[PDB]
Amino acid sequence: GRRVVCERHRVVVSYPPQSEAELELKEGDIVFVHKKREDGWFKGTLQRNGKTGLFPGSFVENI
């Protein structure tokens, strides 16, 4: 019941970052979601490169 801050997701649609605040997503990447924002952007950390940043939530799916 305690907050989930490391929720495992898979990237469904690749996303190129518009700035350094954003994460590059590649299809198939594993991303751990720390926060889902009211504006629909997620904060998470990629397993592949260890980077933390913001990305559009609709581009990922729960595992």
Residue numbers in the entry: 826 to 888
What is the paper's account of this structure, in its own sentences?
We therefore hypothesized that SH3 domains of group 1 have eclipsed conformations, whereas group 2 have staggered conformations. To test our hypothesis, we determined two crystal structures of SH3 domains of the scaffold protein POSH (‘plenty of SH3 domains’), for which the first SH3 domain belongs to group 2 and the fourth SH3 domain belongs to group 1. POSH-SH3-4 shows a similar structure to JIP1-SH3, with an eclipsed conformation of the corresponding phenylalanine residue (F867) stabilized by CH–π interactions from V858 (position 517), K861 (position 520) and G882 (position 541), and by π–π interactions with H834 (position 493).
